[PDB]
């Protein structure tokens, strides 16, 4: 009613409305889905296309060898956080000559979220990230506008995430102990279910990161082959 | 407040403070500028209380630099502040370039500062509309006009202040290129008097050339105003 | 943010609504006069009466001096008046320090109006509700007289009145003032204007204060009339 | 009537509503309890709200942290604020060790954290921390100490405490008997029975993937240590079997 | 975040200064008199219960060895202003090596009050200072105000019913009044304004005796004067 | 509008925030009594939880609760108000005492400490962005002249000395009791005076609160020339004195 | 900071089967005075990590404080035994610190040795760490052991054996001439004893009261000080 | 009534929405990209005849190989262009090669969003069409106040941009030649524009792959292109 004018005012029930609106903005974005198995983590998303004369916008991003993220929400905040994480990883490798601990990086980004939401005159980032990596083990993490992060084994963001989440919970017990090809196939199934009007090599983004497998997006040829495989 | 946004977008997409500054500009005195060949004419209205006010105190038409000159309409204190800023910038340019500041550069700087005072928090927009006349780096005469919003434009003949639209319409149908100095002064006087009471004490016109800015003598102004009054009737 | 006062913000018609209220307050203060003659400049004023126990000796509440050649009179809030007077003295002495010469009056008025404009534009601080009448003398321009206001606007004048009932005083000045006048005639005119604006047929020696600046013998000096001098002056006025 | 829009404004009745709203928010978050026994102290946290999410790894969401490996610190509220306060506690311990080459005494750390929390409830621009914190420790000589700091910035010492959802029922259960004479190892059964009874969202399958456990006792040489499965599972199974009957 | 909480209203009037003046008008009265060879500042403290000690609360202070001060308003504001006045006098003495002139110190304090009225995020002082002193330029008695404007008085009163007290004081006053007569007149005015019964521990007085240090009369002296 | 949301004068000259802070201090309904004699000063309070959202539980160490602290070995204090405010105030008092000792070479006097704390409270009242600390307090000590001194301060920053004072609710009705007891006293060994002052303080608190004052429910401390340190008496002697009163 | 006053003599670290062995004399000379004859010059950062010392004592103590608190911070946010920093991590950290101090022209008059095991597949000690209070040794591949040197100017490197101070001439020669691969503990101790005896005979700042520490699959072991047989 | 960075119930910043609404007015501009290069054209809304027509320019050059076309608030557009060229020259100083168009638009969007603390004070309220050529190829990008930038093959901005983009959709086809692109762009601009097209009524610029240098068509080139314009 009148407790949503600032991000520092607790409502009578004890809720911050600005952070909730940031979460709403995150939900309003496009789709995405991440899955992991014994080895390899597969991330997939729908690159938004605004018109037939517009190439679809980049969706997935690479932060460092074996580390990649997907975005949902405000693009500017996604860019800011991506720059922050890339600089953190590069500095860690520069002054320690080793890969950065992914959990520490997620802690750092969540702490940035917290700092931004705490002080007045500043707004909470209206973007949600989907961290996927292999630091001696496949890991998937999710962040939120309020300083908070969780670690998943199957995740979806925004858009019509209900269908993808239903599919993921329906087939979760098969993800473990399945080859990379079937992992990619299942991720594509989940994305297509969320699509609700077809998947093409142009409007879909796919990436894999696993053991002895640095983060690399799937090229056009293999992506089209997998799309044909799922189509049949 | 201190370091907090004051000029913000309205629901329709308008900067209300900027429009209020434009309204204030529309409140002030009138001014007119003409150019031709290698010289310009600047005219501005005057308004003083007889027998009490000292005419010399008014500084509506001013010289920024050896060559450039300026006229304005709107708030006077802001006019003085911006004029001091512009003179400091002219001398800084002359230090760092060892060349007199061209009219285009100073017009760009005036637009830049007016825009800056519209986009930073804790300061309200500059409520003045100015017009500068000078010579380009290639010894070519040009006059620019700058508004509170920061939008600038070069003109061949222009008018600002109260009833600026009417004087603009008058100029649009009489301006001619490479006119004589007497003809230019006559046109400038006619334009300023179109929307101003007829008297030799309500105008202070000046002429800009490469040599220097020369203020027209009162006797010549009296003769000119008498002639235009005779023609009008 | 919720308690912000909206001070340095343009009005729907471009007036800021704060310089307006400051000027309105100015119009309620005591009246101040200013004249320029062939022998000096006069800043006769009217003293506001609070009680009968105020020290008559010295105690000048309207006219002050900023330098040996510059002196002004106030028509507004006394606190702002005092701090602006201090700033003016600082500015004059800084100019003398820098250039080893006395500051022309125009420079000082320009500086003080610049600080008033700065207070009117930057920050969220309220403007100064004081209007002066700076008058003095210098070689470059001779006797001069100006008139400021909260907006930082200034203008030259040969004869003026500011404050409450400034309209009637200005009318009298315009009706009677002449291009050249003796210092005595100037004082008589200032006293007449003060009496008329006060709506009193005869001014009271305890209700007014006069002063004048003159360049006698090449050394500019100011004189502030004391009760006996104003008494003799009013006796002369009544005689005429 | 405008007296609850800022933490820096006192109400006509002399009361900061903006802090009572924080209290109400905290009381609705996940519940955390901690108590002391002969051998040591046990801290348990119940993440009942996350039962809807079926994609979180088993026992990955942990709300129990430690400082100096011998002081247990836990919270019940916003994750970001709790993390900020934990980092401040670590920084305070670091400064203390640098200055005096010795671990910070607990009763000083609690005071410093209480001051830090309270410092955010007397300005209008800053947002007060929405979290309730518990700090506890144990040593063979001085026995267990438990302290509870709250948004208002008040620290009090307890022999057993519960915060969050259903705190009243849990407290009623805790004061049912005296735990100063029970051993740390056999107290797990009672804790499990209490969380099963009081909370109406957790069942048999929820007990091994939503409740976090830890102790500081003599078995761990009085150092922080998460309880491993081989110990937890027998007690969990026994408790569920007892409840079922 | 630093904006002016005191702003001009339609017709100005600086409402906050008016409210500060109202606060001053409701506090305990305090008056002062300038005599032929000395100045007096007197005030009345409400009859204290048996638990208070008048030695702990003092409404008469001294800034220098010759300058005394009294107030009527908020005690905390008075204390802070007193500390700053002492600091100003100390720095003046450090620079010019002498006792600070009364007019100069009044100017500094008035400037401070004005700045506090102007700056953002603050509210005006809620008292009305009253400074008496002696220097090479004779005696002086000035009054500060929340607005920051000072007045040069010969005899004045501030606080509750200050108009009636001022009228009474004017009724019986002279430019050539003796110091003892001035003390007597101050006592009479305070008694008239009190509307009760006065006695030791109910009044406080300070006097500047010619070229002698400013003195705060003790209980016995005022008791003797009361008879 | 907002005439009382900040430390702003409002009409008829009233800083309502001061009154609201004082009333919040009063609402804590914790009573503290201080009384000075000769070469001895006694400060007594209740060992109970304040009044707020949280209530006292069975598993609460009642010994830990206390409303009396000490700024320095010789200078003692007793705060009453919001818990966080009380902790912040005692920490500020400790800091001021320590800085005074560092910058002057000798231990601070309780009078100067009270004045400085009042100055900080005045600074808080002056500006708008600072909330008021709703915590009143008493300070006790001995000066260089080997005499006791006791002072009181409120959220308004009004520090005042006293010879017998009370913080908490029913202060107006308690001034009468304190006056009566002091008058009865006015009608002794260096240690007998200590005992008399202690019994006077205990009796005053009993009369004001109007019940037993279980020895486990009250806490008393004393500073005297015999000791000069702010040492708080143990439970056994408090119980013995209470039995004597009966 | 402005020059050594109280200094250590030298340290010798060598990797052998079952881990690494590091020895140093227990003496800190105050110029040519030998004020302190019982000083611990070999510190411990964590299990599978130790720090050497040959230089000014104050700087060594400050660096020890820094490293131990870095280890505390690492533990505070630790969740799996793989999260513990390796000797390479600490070596790079100290190298960076030394480089920064050099760039500021305020070095630490020290020559540090950081030695440990950078592999976690051999023992389960780090899964339950114990800072306060405290089977058969497992053979360790030499690739899993780490020894790193750090110089005043930040120069750093890694090798199979490192020495500082005067040990860089005598003990270094002896090791290069005789050091073997996968030598049992007895042989390594014999070699270290020969090196330290040679130093004792031809080094004024040395002494025969010796501290020997071993980093192995069982953790860090401080052997009881003994006097050189001579 | 609210801060510059106050979220809405739906998750959109109010100021960003108002700026996006404001950018809907101004001179119309069109841009096209083909394998041979990129072309930009502007309405050139000339005011009264007293203007020189040279001071008012709608086609600036961020760098030798990059062209731009603004719409909305002119002063904000000039500020953004100044920052863009400063950063492009900084890139050229730091790296011998020339800045890629993608990086330039990234920096411009970063500045545009700088207003939110995470200095400036409010959204810029400008919409920019950048076009250029690099080693990667010829391409053009579109930037709006919200910060989100998008690559385009044939786009339009300014008042009536809906009609211009509709026509571009109806006509633009891949594998087009540079002359075809020029004639198509001028056809669309003429169609959407109010008055009759002429030498001084519209302005054009183009960047070629072979040249890789920004080139602004003068009166002669525009006269030639209009002469061969189908009608």
């Amino acid at each position: 009613n009148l407790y949503d004018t600032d991000n520092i005012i607790y409502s009578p029930e004890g809720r911050l409305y600005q952070v909730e609106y940031a979460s709403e903005a995150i939900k309003q974005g496009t789709c995405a889905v991440a899955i992991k198995s014994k080895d390899y983590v597969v991330v997939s998303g729908l690159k938004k296309c605004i018109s037939k004369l517009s190439f679809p916008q980049e969706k997935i991003f690479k932060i460092d060898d074996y580390i990649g993220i997907s975005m949902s929400g405000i693009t500017s905040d996604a860019k800011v956080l991506t720059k922050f994480m890339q600089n953190e990883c590069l500095s860690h490798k520069f002054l320690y000559n080793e890969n950065i601990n992914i959990e520490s990086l997620v802690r750092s980004v969540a702490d940035k979220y917290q700092k931004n939401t705490q002080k007045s005159s500043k707004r909470a980032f209206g973007v949600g990230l989907m961290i996927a990596a292999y630091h001696n083990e496949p890991c998937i993490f999710e962040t939120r506008p309020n300083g908070s992060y969780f670690e998943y084994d199957a995740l979806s963001f925004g858009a019509r995430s209900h269908a993808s989440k239903t599919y993921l919970e329906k087939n979760l017990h098969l993800f473990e102990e399945c080859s990379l090809e079937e992992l990619i196939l299942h991720c594509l199934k989940a994305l297509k279910c969320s699509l609700s009007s077809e998947l093409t090599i142009s409007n879909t983004a796919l990436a894999v990161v696993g053991k002895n497998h640095p983060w690399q997006e799937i090229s056009s040829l293999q992506l089209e082959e997998y799309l044909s495989k799922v189509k049949m | 407040s201190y370091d907090r946004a004051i000029t913000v977008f309205s629901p329709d997409g308008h900067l209300l403070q900027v429009e209020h500054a434009l309204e204030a500009v529309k409140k002030g005195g009138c001014a007119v500028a003409i150019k031709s060949s290698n010289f310009a004419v600047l005219a501005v209205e005057k308004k003083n209380i007889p027998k009490l006010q000292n005419p010399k105190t008014t500084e509506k038409l001013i010289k920024l630099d050896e060559h450039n000159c300026l006229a304005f309409a709107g708030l006077n204190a802001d006019a003085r502040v911006l004029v001091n800023k512009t003179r400091l910038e002219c001398q800084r340019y002359y230090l760092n370039m060892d060349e007199p500041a061209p009219v285009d550069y100073i017009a760009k700087y005036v637009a830049k500062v007016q825009q800056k005072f519209t986009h930073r928090g804790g300061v309200r927009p500059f409520g003045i509309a100015t017009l500068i006349a000078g010579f380009k780096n290639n010894k070519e005469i040009c006059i620019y006009q700058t508004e509170p919003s920061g939008i600038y434009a070069a003109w061949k003949a222009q008018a600002i202040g109260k009833n600026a639209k009417i004087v603009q319409e008058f100029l649009e149908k009489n301006y001619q290129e490479n006119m004589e100095q007497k003809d230019c002064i006559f046109l400038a006087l006619k334009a300023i008097f179109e929307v101003v009471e007829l008297s030799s004490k309500n105008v202070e016109v000046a002429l800009l050339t490469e040599k220097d800015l020369t203020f027209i003598e009162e006797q010549e102004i009296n003769s000119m105003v008498e002639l235009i009054d005779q023609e009008r009737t | 943010r919720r308690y912000d006062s909206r001070t340095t913000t343009f009005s729907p018609e471009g007036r800021l609504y704060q310089v307006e209220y400051a000027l309105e307050a100015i119009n309620n203060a005591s009246i101040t006069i200013g004249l320029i003659t062939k022998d000096g400049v006069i800043l006769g004023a009217d003293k506001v009466f609070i009680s009968k126990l105020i020290d008559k000796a010295n105690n000048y509440e309207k006219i002050y001096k900023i330098d040996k050649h510059i002196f002004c009179g106030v028509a507004g809030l006394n606190a702002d008046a005092n701090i602006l007077i201090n700033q003016s003295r600082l500015y004059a002495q800084r100019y003398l320090y820098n250039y080893n010469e006395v500051q022309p009056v125009s420079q000082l008025v320009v500086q003080i109006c610049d600080i008033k404009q700065s207070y009117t534009q930057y920050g969220g601080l309220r403007p100064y509700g004081v209007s002066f009448l700076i008058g003095g003398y210098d070689t470059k321009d001779g006797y001069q007289l100006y008139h400021t206001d909260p907006s930082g606007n200034y203008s030259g004048w040969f004869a003026t009145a500011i404050g409450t009932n400034n309209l009637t005083a200005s009318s009298v000045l315009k009706q009677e003032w002449k291009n050249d006048m003796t210092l005595e005639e100037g004082l008589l005119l200032a006293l007449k204007t003060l009496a008329k604006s006060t709506d009193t047929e005869i001014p009271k020696s305890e209700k007014i204060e006069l002063a004048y600046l003159t360049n006698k013998d090449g050394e500019v000096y100011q004189k502030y009339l004391t009760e006996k001098e104003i008494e003799e002056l009013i006796k002369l006025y009544t005689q005429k | 009537a405008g007296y609850d829009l800022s933490v820096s404004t006192f109400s006509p009745d002399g009361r900061l509503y903006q802090v009572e709203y924080i209290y109400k928010s905290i009381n609705n978050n996940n519940t955390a309890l901690c108590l002391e026994c002969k051998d040591g102290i046990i801290c348990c946290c119940i993440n009942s709200n996350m039962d809807k999410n079926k994609m979180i790894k088993k026992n990955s969401y942990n709300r129990i942290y430690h400082v100096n490996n011998n002081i247990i610190i836990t919270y019940s509220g916003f994750d970001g604020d709790a993390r900020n306060i934990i980092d401040r506690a670590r920084s305070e311990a670091n400064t203390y060790y640098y200055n005096f080459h010795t671990n910070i005494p607990l009763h000083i750390l609690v005071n410093r954290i209480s001051l830090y929390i309270h410092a955010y409830t007397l300005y209008w621009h800053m947002r007060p921390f929405a979290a309730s914190i518990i700090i506890s420790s144990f040593n063979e000589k001085d026995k267990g100490d438990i302290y509870c700091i709250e948004p208002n910035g008040a620290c009090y010492k307890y022999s057993g405490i519960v915060i969050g959802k259903n705190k009243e029922m849990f407290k009623t259960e805790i004061e049912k008997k005296d735990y100063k004479d029970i051993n740390v190892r056999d107290a797990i059964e009672d804790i499990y029975k209490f969380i099963l009874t009081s909370d109406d969202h957790m069942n048999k399958n929820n007990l091994q993937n939503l409740v976090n456990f830890s102790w500081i006792c003599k078995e761990s040489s009085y150092e922080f240590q998460n309880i491993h499965e081989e110990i937890l599972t027998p007690a969990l199974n026994k408790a569920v079997e007892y409840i079922e009957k | 975040y630093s904006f002016s909480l005191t702003t001009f209203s339609p017709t100005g009037k600086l409402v906050q200064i008016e409210y500060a003046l109202n606060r001053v008008s409701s506090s305990s009265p305090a008056l002062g008199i300038r005599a032929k060879n000395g100045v007096i500042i007197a005030t009345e403290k409400k009859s204290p219960n048996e638990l208070i000690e008048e030695n702990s609360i003092f409404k008469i202070q001294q800034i220098s060895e010759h300058i005394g001060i009294v107030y009527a308003g908020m005690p905390g504001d008075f204390r802070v202003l007193l500390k700053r006045a002492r600091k100003e006098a100390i720095r003046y003495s450090l620079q010019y090596g002498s006792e600070i002139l009364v007019k100069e110190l009044v100017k500094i304090i008035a400037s401070i009050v004005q700045e506090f009225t102007q700056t953002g995020g603050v509210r005006p002082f809620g008292l009305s200072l009253l400074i008496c002193g002696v220097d090479v330029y004779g005696y002086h008695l000035y009054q500060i105000d929340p607005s920051g404007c000072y007045f040069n008085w010969m005899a004045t009163c501030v606080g509750k019913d200050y108009q009636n007290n001022m009228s009474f004081l004017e009724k019986r006053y002279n430019k050539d009044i003796e110091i003892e007569d001035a003390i007597h007149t101050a006592i009479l005015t305070l008694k008239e304004s009190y509307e009760g019964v006065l006695n030791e521990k109910n009044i406080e007085i300070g006097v500047a005796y010619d070229n002698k240090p400013f003195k705060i009369l003790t209980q016995n002296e005022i008791k003797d004067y009361l008879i | 509008m907002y005439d009382r949301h900040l430390t702003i004068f409002s009409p008829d000259g009233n800083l309502y925030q001061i009154e609201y802070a004082i009333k919040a201090v009063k609402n804590t309904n914790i009573t503290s009594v201080g009384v000075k004699g000769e070469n001895c000063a006694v400060i007594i309070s209740q060992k109970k939880m304040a009044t707020q959202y949280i209530s006292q539980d069975k598993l609460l160490d009642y010994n830990n609760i206390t409303n009396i602290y000490n700024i320095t070995d010789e200078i003692g204090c007793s705060m009453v108000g919001m818990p966080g405010d009380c902790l912040s105030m005692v920490y500020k008092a400790r800091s001021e005492a320590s800085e005074f000792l560092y910058s002057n070479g000798y231990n601070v006097n309780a009078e100067t400490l009270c004045r400085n704390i009042c100055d900080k409270i005045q600074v808080y009242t002056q500006h708008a962005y600072m909330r008021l600390h709703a915590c009143s307090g008493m300070i006790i000590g001995i000066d260089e002249n080997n005499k006791p001194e006791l002072f009181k301060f409120d959220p308004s920053g009004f520090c005042a000395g006293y010879r017998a004072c009370v913080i908490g609710n029913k202060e107006q009705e308690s001034i009468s009791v304190l006056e009566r007891l002091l008058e009865k006293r006015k009608k002794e060994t260096i240690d007998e005076d200590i005992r008399n002052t202690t019994i006077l303080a205990i009796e005053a608190l009993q009369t004001i609160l109007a019940f037993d004052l279980k020895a486990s429910e009250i806490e008393v401390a004393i500073v005297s020339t015999k000791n000069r340190n702010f040492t708080q008496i143990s439970e056994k002697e408090i119980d013995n004195y209470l039995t004597y009163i009966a | 900071t402005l020059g050594p006053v109280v200094t250590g003599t030298s340290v010798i670290a060598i990797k052998y089967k079952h881990g690494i062995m590091i020895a140093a004399d227990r003496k800190a000379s105050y110029g040519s005075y030998a004020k302190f004859q019982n000083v611990e010059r070999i510190f411990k950062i964590n299990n599978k990590t130790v720090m050497g010392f040959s230089g000014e004592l104050a700087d060594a103590q400050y660096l020890h404080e820094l490293l131990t608190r870095k280890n505390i911070n690492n533990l505070s946010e630790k969740k799996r035994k793989e999260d513990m920093y390796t000797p390479q991590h600490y070596h790079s950290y100290v190298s960076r610190v030394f480089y920064v101090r050099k760039n500021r022209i305020d070095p630490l008059f020290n020559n540090i040795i950081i030695a440990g095991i950078n592999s976690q597949k051999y023992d389960n000690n780090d899964d339950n760490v114990l800072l306060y209070t405290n089977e058969e040794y497992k053979e360790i591949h030499k690739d899993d052991l780490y020894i790193g040197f750090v110089d005043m100017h930040g120069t750093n490197f890694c090798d199979d054996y490192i020495t500082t101070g005067y040990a860089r001439y005598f003990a270094l020669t002896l090791l290069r001439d005789h050091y073997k691969d996968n030598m049992t503990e007895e042989e390594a101790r014999i070699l270290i004893n020969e090196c330290l005896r040679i130093l004792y005979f031809r080094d004024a700042t040395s002494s025969n009261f010796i501290q020997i520490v071993k980093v192995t699959s069982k953790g860090v072991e401080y052997e009881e000080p003994y006097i050189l047989p001579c | 009534d609210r801060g510059v960075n106050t979220f809405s119930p739906e998750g959109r910043l109010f100021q960003v929405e108002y700026a996006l609404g404001a950018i809907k007015l101004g001179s119309t501009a069109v841009g096209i990209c083909v394998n041979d290069g990129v072309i930009l054209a502007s309405e050139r809304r000339i005011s009264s005849t007293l203007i020189e027509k040279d001071s008012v320019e709608k086609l600036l050059s961020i760098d030798d190989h990059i062209g731009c076309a603004m719409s909305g608030l002119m002063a904000d557009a000039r500020t953004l262009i100044d920052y863009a060229r400063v950063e492009c020259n900084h890139y050229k100083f730091i790296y011998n090669e020339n800045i890629n168009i993608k990086s330039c638009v990234e920096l411009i969007s970063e500045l545009a969003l700088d207003f939110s603390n995470l200095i400036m004070s409010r959204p810029f309220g400008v919409a920019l069409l950048i076009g250029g050529v690099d080693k990667n190829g010829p391409c053009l990008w579109y930037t709006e106040p919200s910060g989100t930038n998008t690559r385009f093959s044939a786009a339009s901005i300014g008042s009536a941009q809906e009609g211009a983009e509709l026509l571009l959709q109806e006509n633009y086809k891949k594998d087009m030649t540079f002359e075809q692109a020029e004639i198509l762009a001028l056809t669309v601009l003429r169609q959407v524009m109010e008055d009759k097209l002429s030498t001084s009524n519209v302005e054009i610029c183009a960047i070629k792959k072979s040249d890789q240098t920004f080139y602004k068509y003068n009166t002669d080139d525009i006269s030639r292109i209009i002469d061969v314009l189908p009608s």
Side-chain angles (χ1 to χ4, degrees), chain G residues 2-39 41-76 78-122 124-132 137-176 178-179 181-185 187-223 225-229:
Chain G
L2 201 59
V5 179
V6 180
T7 81
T9 304
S10 61
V11 304
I12 299 167
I14 83 175
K15 62 173 68 172
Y16 78 118
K17 63 187 288 185
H18 308 300
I20 46 186
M21 192 165 258
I22 189 171
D25 55 22
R26 293 171 74 73
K27 156 160 157 185
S29 282
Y30 182 12
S32 64
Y33 181 87
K35 197 142 153 200
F36 318 100
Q37 313 226 17
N38 189 353
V39 190
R41 304 205 301 116
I42 295 158
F43 300 109
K44 144 177 178 154
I45 305 121
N46 67 6
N47 306 310
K48 312 167 215 172
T49 316
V50 297
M51 165 260 269
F53 178 15
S54 41
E56 153 74 30
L57 185 52
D59 306 314
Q61 301 221 296
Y62 161 90
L63 191 44
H64 157 88
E65 289 291 327
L66 252 58
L67 279 187
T68 190
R69 206 71 191 174
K70 181 179 176 69
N71 156 49
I72 279 279
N73 290 334
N74 174 218
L75 194 52
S76 267
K78 184 222 76 178
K79 174 192 321 312
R80 215 150 63 93
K81 73 177 185 178
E82 294 71 348
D83 294 26
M84 310 305 278
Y85 297 152
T86 52
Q88 193 303 339
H89 187 91
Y90 288 113
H91 177 256
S92 63
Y93 176 69
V94 299
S95 304
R96 181 57 177 177
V97 167
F98 268 76
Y99 176 84
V100 163
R101 286 200 150 257
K102 159 180 92 71
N103 279 13
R104 188 143 36 85
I105 303 161
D106 61 354
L108 307 164
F109 294 95
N110 289 36
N111 297 293
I112 311 296
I113 297 197
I114 310 297
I117 317 182
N118 64 41
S119 178
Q120 283 256 10
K121 64 194 208 73
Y122 288 106
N124 297 291
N125 297 95
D126 275 355
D127 62 0
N128 270 324
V129 157
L130 287 155
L131 318 176
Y132 324 111
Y137 298 84
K138 312 236 173 75
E139 301 152 2
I140 289 304
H141 205 294
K142 65 201 271 283
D143 295 329
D144 301 322
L145 304 169
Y146 185 87
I147 317 181
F149 180 85
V150 182
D151 176 17
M152 284 211 57
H153 293 84
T155 298
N156 45 310
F157 57 92
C158 173
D159 213 0
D160 290 332
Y161 44 84
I162 314 190
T163 83
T164 73
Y166 263 80
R168 215 159 61 70
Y169 308 101
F170 306 86
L172 198 47
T173 311
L174 257 297
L175 296 154
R176 287 176 181 171
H178 288 311
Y179 171 78
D181 226 326
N182 292 37
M183 44 171 29
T184 66
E185 140 165 33
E187 318 167 89
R189 186 171 296 172
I190 288 159
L191 187 48
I192 288 171
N193 280 328
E194 302 330 289
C195 296
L196 290 160
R197 163 167 320 118
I198 289 294
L199 290 173
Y200 173 52
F201 283 1
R202 323 298 271 207
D203 193 25
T205 74
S206 149
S207 71
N208 53 19
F209 192 63
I210 277 186
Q211 169 52 274
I212 182 159
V213 193
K214 333 183 291 185
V215 184
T216 63
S217 90
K218 302 158 101 146
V220 184
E221 271 156 300
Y222 286 108
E223 263 192 326
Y226 65 87
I227 294 169
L228 219 38

Side-chain angles (χ1 to χ4, degrees), chain F residues 119-130:
Chain F
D119 277 354
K120 314 302 191 33
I121 285 153
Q122 153 51 13
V123 160
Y124 280 175
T125 53
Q126 186 71 41
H127 288 61
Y129 75 115
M130 271 315 327

Side-chain angles (χ1 to χ4, degrees), chain F residues 148-169:
Chain F
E149 61 156 50
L150 174 150
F151 275 69
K152 200 179 94 80
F153 80 90
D154 293 70
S156 62
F158 170 67
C159 172
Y162 280 93
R163 45 201 292 271
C165 83
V166 53
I167 275 166
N169 59 5

